[PDB]
Amino acid sequence: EYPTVSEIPVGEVRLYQIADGVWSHIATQSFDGAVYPSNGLIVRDGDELLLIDTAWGAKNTAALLAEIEKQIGLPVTRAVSTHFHDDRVGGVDVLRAAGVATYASPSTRRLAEVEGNEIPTHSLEGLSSSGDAVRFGPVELFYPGAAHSTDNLVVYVPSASVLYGGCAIYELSRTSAGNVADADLAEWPTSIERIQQHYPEAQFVIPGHGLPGGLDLLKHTTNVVKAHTNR
Template identity: 50%
Template sequence: MKYHAFYAPWLLLLGLLTVGCQSDHRHSPPGNPGLQVEQLEPGVWMHTSYNTFDGVLYPSNGLIVREGDHLVLLDSAWGAEATEELQVWIDEEIGLPVDRALSTHFHSDRTGGVAVLEAAGIPVWSHPMTQRLSAEEGNPVPANALKGIEAPGSTTGSGSLEVLYPGGGHARDNIMVWLPEQKILYGGCAVRELATDNLGNTADADLGYWPQAIRHAQAMYPQAEVVIPGHGKPGGPELLEHMHTLFEDSGN
């Protein structure tokens, strides 16, 4: 099932109704929906956790990808407790080990559960810059650095997946992950959902290069059918085109 903006509300409702798509919320703060997991394709699940930024509750997306007899986690859940909850869900609902995880930039919505994963014996990988920026920010630091993606527009393999460093965008170190079999591009926080009318948190953004970073992604993966933003509803390649509208509206 390919994910496009027209179908997103129906699919979100389906995800909420599906058994196992919402975990036990007893430990979630008031108003926090807790962990949600939705299957997008055979062998691909989107996990969504919630936390507050500047007093506003936001959803944060990541992916679980099956590779044969094991799984790959794209970004931890938002925080240690949510990541522990995600591990329980994976054990109970999928029952396969997580072979490795990737953190797509240094902010806490991507790295908040790194220590939990590494304590469970799951190696976490990131752009080399993410290690430095995480340490400077006081966030958990992924122990492993991907090689060969220092230059904007460069890629490297990670099992069945391809990792793109498009250049600075939402953050200087943001990476994207391509799932070639499913034609899914995990854009992370470098991509905004279609419903947004602004660039979001730009405190650590590379506003000058961000448009070029999106053009790199468009040029590399013109066959993408599904694009997953770091926050909000997935869509198709129109999410990448939407970014250029946001850049123009912001005068960038």
């Protein structure tokens, strides 16, 4: 049922309802000659929506807003980017122009600026040390420690037991690390264990790219990371 890379024409955005008031958004980026899927999250909060992550690029993010208006019809009032790379912040300027208040940790904003990427407007306090958590509308934001990037956040929806791992969590079909240029390989397994410790009740786990599963995705990611460490 979950849309896969091949089932989404490039440039389009699909929404997948995970639970009451919780969707993922799925988009594609054809880069270096190959096609990659990417996930973000949408969480209802009363009569408004919280967006987690852009759809990787201005045109994709414009299509995301159009699909949200078409299928859900509630306004996106805030957005959080979970780390500084273009698959999370590319499209922030589109969100800002549409009147969405954009947020990231101060570490993410700084890294995005250094990279020349788009920079969310607001700074999320209370997330600077591993293990820190804060509530943000209908979600909890959690900084597990450095992993895929030093600034990566994860997002938990307590009403639905949905854990969105972003790019710190790999889908099961990804058995090699790929590009990890900004990762902390040494800390990544420890950061994953903090996620497990904090969200042992999670029933759905959404990776940054590809198919959702359960908490098994965490130990799978640790296995991939450790194998890459010993490469």
